[PDB]
């Protein structure tokens, strides 16, 4: 069918232009219609603007004068520009493919029907934060368990912005593993915890390593865990 | 956009009014968005489900005028808990730019499940970082509400310590996490340190030492 | 003076508030009501009803029925009235059946415009009137013999208002659109319209010739009751563009696009605001009949 | 209203008020059948 994948700078500078960028999968770009649509916390989701099959521009008179939302058919990729940011514009970025409908209630002839628009099919979602600050890169450490059922993991401390993403033996280990959500210390960096759930007759005979990654540090570090 | 809270039993029937009645002939869809998530179509049309979504979600047609748009969901689980929006259209008012305020359903009568605290004493590499930490996981609780203290051999510690507010599991139980930022001397200089984890009625103790 | 927006949503009827008098002769009261632009002028946003400059109106009374009635015409004593039972008596002439009658049938006062509605049907086959046929300023008057179908409505759900006027006094005025917005209009079978167009063609041929084209074009222009099918259903009066019934030269449905006047003034003078009707209004008739014009291929 | 009055009738109809010369007196009233009857 149909996917979407969103990805973006994950950090802006305030007064500056919020590129992102969103491919679709398994479908034309040339043949529905694409909405953006952002969630900041404390607040609703809030549709930006949607280009149609015949690439026509319509954005919300909300945000109107800073959007800008094109695409590129060589691909299936669809563009988003939003400049002169500011600390109300960080939001998760969604990007789904809105389907048109026409609601007739009267006669077609006298114009008496209106246009609405559904989305199906969402992307995931790209982590979008404005601030001055600039980025940084995490620093995993080791955490050892001791001893029929034990558990470790790895301390990511001290990044900037959220998020990361921590994967256990490059995906092997997928089972028992919780990754714990993020806390923004009062010097102002999020820092992670994730723990995996072992059987302690494992641990002598199978090894473990966290993949932590952190895109906008550009960052791929790794580390083992032993007693 | 603000929210309006829902409350219905485990089992029964949610009945979610939209809070924007139309005017004329209207075109309603229904989104489920489970906060830091990506949000579900549930209806689209008036009346119409996509592929994927179960019968117990329902949405009134408008047939005859007057009939105000409401969602229904029939035997609701404890995963059926997020936000609902309405969006609404019809002939009389403009385009729907907004989505609806928000509906979020918070389902009771769910099981209680006692929390899994497992206290990390400070790693080797960062102790010869000069800094230590002690990492409190708290995972599996329902409802999602735990308090954290902190005990220095036994005298309270307050200062220094940061707590994560309880987010939501895959398998709809809570989880938090609670880090102690301590000087590697000030880690070594005491006995124990435990983690109190006080979850509805009964406080659970996770201690560690320096050995 | 009229304080007039529209009607959010094309741009027809307005949304108007006023100061008005009251029970009271020292106070006032801002009220609103809608009024269709067919009833409404500008000053140079402020507008004023059509008649302020012409006559004052007479609401019409919201008990009496505008229903037209069978009406029997009849003789006093000392007195006559023939029938003519020639069913294909063209308007003047001899009659050779002949029958004495003391009142005549049921008359219908249907008032109407280019189309007669509801009204008396031809036997045998449909025939044709006027006086001096050649003559082009005389109208011919053509009697179906088979009744056309049409069905008009207002489609939109109004509300009717009343408005304490003074001691007594009530205007009733138009509240609110309650649902859709839509158009009035009215529906003729396009297959029973040409079958109809078929026959009135027919006995055209025998006045004007077996070879001659017979061309059907709209109104000519002038006022809006002889431009348009001005009719009433329901308590209200249409004014319906017969320019797609009158297009033609020698499962279907032809919808004709009806305004609405509420002051209308009716042969000449003082004029008549028809109350609103609440509901959605929708008549059914029978076109019998028709009123056409040559122009003088 | 809420001092401030109104007349009873204003809020239901108007009212004429009686010319001063014409009398209520009751009348002797005859009533007669026409020729015929
Ligand atoms: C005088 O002359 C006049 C001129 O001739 C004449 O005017 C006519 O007036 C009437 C009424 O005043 C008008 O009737 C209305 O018609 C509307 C349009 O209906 C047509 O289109 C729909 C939708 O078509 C899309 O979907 C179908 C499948 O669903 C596809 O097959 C189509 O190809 C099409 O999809 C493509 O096109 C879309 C664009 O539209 C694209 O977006 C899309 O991507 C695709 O590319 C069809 O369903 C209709 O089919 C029906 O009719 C056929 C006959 O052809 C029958 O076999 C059968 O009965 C079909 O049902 C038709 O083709 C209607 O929307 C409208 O009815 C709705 O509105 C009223 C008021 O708003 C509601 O009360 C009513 O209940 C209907 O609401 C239903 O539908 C809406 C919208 O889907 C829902 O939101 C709502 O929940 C409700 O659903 C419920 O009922 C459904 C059944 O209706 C059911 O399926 C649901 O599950 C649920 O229970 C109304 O009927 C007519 O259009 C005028 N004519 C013209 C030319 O405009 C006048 O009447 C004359 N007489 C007078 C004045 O007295
Ligand atoms: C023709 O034009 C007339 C005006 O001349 C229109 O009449 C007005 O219509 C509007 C709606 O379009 C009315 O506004 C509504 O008033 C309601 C009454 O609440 C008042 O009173 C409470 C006290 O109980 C106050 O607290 C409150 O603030 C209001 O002053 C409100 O309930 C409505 O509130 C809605 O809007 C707000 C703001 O957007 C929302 O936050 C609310 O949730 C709610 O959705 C609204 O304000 C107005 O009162 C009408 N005026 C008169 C004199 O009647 C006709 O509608 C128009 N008709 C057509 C066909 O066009
Ligand atoms: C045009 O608009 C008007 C309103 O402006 C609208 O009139 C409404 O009609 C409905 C009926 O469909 C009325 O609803 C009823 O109200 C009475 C009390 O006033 C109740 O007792 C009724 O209870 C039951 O009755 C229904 C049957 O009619 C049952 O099916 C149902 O189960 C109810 O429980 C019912 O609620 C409504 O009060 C009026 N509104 C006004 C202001 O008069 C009219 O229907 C519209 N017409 C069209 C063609 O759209
Ligand atoms: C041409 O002649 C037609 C036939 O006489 C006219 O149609 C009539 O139109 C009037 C007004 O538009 C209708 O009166 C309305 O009646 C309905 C309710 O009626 C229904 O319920 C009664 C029960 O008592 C039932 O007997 C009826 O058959 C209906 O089922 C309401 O909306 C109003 O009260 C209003 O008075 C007539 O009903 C209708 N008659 C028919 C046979 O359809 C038409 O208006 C004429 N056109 C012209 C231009 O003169
Ligand atoms: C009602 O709507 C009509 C059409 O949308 C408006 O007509 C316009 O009137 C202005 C006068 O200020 C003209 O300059 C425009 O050219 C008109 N537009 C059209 C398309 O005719 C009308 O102004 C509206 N009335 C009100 C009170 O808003
Ligand atoms: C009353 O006012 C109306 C305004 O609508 C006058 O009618 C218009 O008159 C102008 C000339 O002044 C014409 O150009 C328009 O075509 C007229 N329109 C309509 C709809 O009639 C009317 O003449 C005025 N009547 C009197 C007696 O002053
Ligand atoms: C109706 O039919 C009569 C005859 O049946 C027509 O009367 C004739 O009219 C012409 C003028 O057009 C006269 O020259 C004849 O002398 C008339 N004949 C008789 C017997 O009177 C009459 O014209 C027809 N009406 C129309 C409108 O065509
Ligand atoms: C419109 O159509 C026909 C005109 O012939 C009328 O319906 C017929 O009326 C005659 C006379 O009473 C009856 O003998 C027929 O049985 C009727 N046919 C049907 C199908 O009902 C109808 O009354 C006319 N309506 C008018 C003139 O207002
Ligand atoms: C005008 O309206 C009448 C009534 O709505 C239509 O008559 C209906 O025709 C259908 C289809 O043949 C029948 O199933 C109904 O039983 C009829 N209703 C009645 C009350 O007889 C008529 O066809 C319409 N005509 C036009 C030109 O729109
Ligand atoms: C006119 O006003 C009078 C006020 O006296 C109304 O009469 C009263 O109405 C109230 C209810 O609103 C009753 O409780 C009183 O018992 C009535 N009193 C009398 C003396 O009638 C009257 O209903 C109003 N009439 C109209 C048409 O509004
Ligand atoms: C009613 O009169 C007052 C007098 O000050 C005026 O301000 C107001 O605009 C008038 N209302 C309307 C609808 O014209
Ligand atoms: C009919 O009118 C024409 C002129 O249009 C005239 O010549 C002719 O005499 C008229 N016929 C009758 C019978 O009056
Ligand atoms: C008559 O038709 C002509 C052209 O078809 C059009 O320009 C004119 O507005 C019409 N007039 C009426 C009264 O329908
Ligand atoms: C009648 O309709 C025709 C087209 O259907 C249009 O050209 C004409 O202007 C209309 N007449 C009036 C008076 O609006």
């Known amino acids: 069918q149909v996917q979407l994948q969103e990805s973006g700078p994950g950090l802006v500078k305030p007064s500056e232009t919020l590129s992102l960028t969103c491919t679709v999968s398994?479908?034309?770009?040339?043949?529905?219609?694409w909405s953006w649509i952002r969630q900041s916390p404390g607040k609703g989701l809030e549709w930006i603007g949607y280009?149609?099959?015949?690439?026509?521009?319509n954005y919300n008179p909300s945000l109107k004068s800073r959007v800008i939302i094109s695409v590129d058919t060589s691909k299936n990729q669809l563009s988003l520009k939003l400049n002169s940011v500011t600390a109300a514009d960080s939001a998760i970025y969604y990007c789904?493919?809105?389907?048109?409908?026409?609601?007739?209630?009267?006669?077609?002839?006298?114009?008496?029907?209106?246009?609405?628009?559904?989305?199906?099919?969402w992307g995931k979602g790209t982590t979008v934060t404005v601030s001055s600050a600039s980025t940084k890169g995490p620093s995993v450490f080791p955490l050892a368990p001791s001893s029929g059922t034990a558990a470790l993991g790895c301390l990511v401390k001290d990044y900037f912005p959220e998020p990361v993403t921590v994967s256990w033996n490059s995906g092997a280990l997928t089972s028992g593993v919780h990754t714990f959500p993020a806390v923004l210390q009062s010097s102002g960096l999020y820092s992670l915890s994730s723990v995996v759930t072992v059987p302690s007759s494992s641990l002598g005979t199978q090894t473990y390593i966290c993949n932590v990654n952190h895109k906008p540090s550009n960052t791929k570090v790794d580390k083992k865990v032993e007693p | 956009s603000y929210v309006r809270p829902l409350s219905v039993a485990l089992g029964e029937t949610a009945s979610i009014s939209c809070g924007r009645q139309a005017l004329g002939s209207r075109a309603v869809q229904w989104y489920q968005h489970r906060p830091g998530q990506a949000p579900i179509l549930l209806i689209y049309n008036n009346q119409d489900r996509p592929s994927g979504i179960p019968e117990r979600f329902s949405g009134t047609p408008d047939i005859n005028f007057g009939t105000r748009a409401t969602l229904t969901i029939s035997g609701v689980e404890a995963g059926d808990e997020a936000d609902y929006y309405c969006h609404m259209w019809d002939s009389r008012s403009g385009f729907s730019w907004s989505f609806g305020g928000a509906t979020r359903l918070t389902v009771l009568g769910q099981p209680k499940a006692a929390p899994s605290v497992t206290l990390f004493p400070p790693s080797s590499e960062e102790l010869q970082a000069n800094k230590a930490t002690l990492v409190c996981l708290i995972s599996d609780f329902y409802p999602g509400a735990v308090t954290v203290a902190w005990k220095a051999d036994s005298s309270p510690v307050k200062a220094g310590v940061e707590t994560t507010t309880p987010s939501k599991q895959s398998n709809n139980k809570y989880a938090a996490s609670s880090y102690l930022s301590l000087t590697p001397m000030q880690w070594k200089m005491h006995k124990s340190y435990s983690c109190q984890v006080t979850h509805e009625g009964s406080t659970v103790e996770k201690t560690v030492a320096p050995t | 003076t009229l304080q007039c927006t529209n009607v959010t949503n094309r741009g027809e009827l307005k949304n108007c508030s006023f100061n008005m008098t009251t029970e009271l002769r020292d106070k006032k009261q801002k009220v609103y009501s809608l009024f269709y632009r067919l009833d409404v002028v500008q000053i140079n946003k402020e507008y004023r009803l059509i008649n302020c400059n012409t006559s004052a109106c007479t609401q019409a009374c919201p008990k009496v029925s505008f229903e037209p009635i069978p009406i029997h015409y009849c003789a006093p004593a000392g007195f006559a009235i023939l029938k003519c039972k020639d069913k294909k008596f063209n308007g003047t002439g001899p009659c050779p059946s002949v029958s004495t009658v003391q009142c005549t049938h049921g008359i219908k006062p249907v008032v109407s415009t280019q189309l007669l509605l509801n009204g008396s049907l031809a036997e045998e086959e449909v025939m044709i009137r006027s006086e001096n046929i050649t003559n082009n300023a005389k109208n011919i008057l053509v009697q179906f013999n088979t009744p056309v179908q049409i069905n008009c409505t207002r489609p939109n759900n109004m509300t009717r208002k009343s408005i304490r006027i003074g001691p007594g006094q009530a205007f009733y005025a138009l509240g609110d659109i309650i649902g859709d917005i839509r158009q009035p209009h009215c529906n003729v079978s396009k297959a029973t319209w040409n079958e109809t167009l078929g026959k009135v063609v027919k006995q055209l041929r025998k006045h004007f010739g077996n070879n001659t084209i017979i061309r059907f074009a709209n109104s000519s222009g002038g006022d809006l009751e002889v431009t348009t099918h001005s009719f009433n259903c329901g308590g209200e009066f249409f004014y319906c563009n017969t320019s797609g019934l009158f297009n033609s030269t020698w499962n279907d449905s032809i919808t004709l696009p009806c305004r609405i006047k509420q002051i209308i003034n009716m042969w000449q003078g003082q004029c008549m605001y028809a109350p609103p009707i609440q509901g959605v209004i929708r008549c059914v008739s029978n076109i019998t009949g028709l009123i056409l014009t040559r122009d003088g291929t | 209203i809420n001092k401030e009055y109104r007349l009873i009738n204003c809020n239901t109809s108007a009212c004429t008020q009686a010319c001063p010369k014409v009398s209520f007196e009751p009348i002797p009233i005859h009533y007669c059948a026409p020729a015929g009857f």
């Open positions: 789904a493919r809105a389907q048109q409908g026409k609601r007739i209630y009267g006669m077609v002839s006298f114009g008496e029907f209106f246009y609405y628009y559904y989305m199906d099919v």
């Open positions: 398994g479908g034309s770009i040339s043949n529905y219609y």
């Open positions: 280009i149609s099959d015949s690439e026509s521009t």
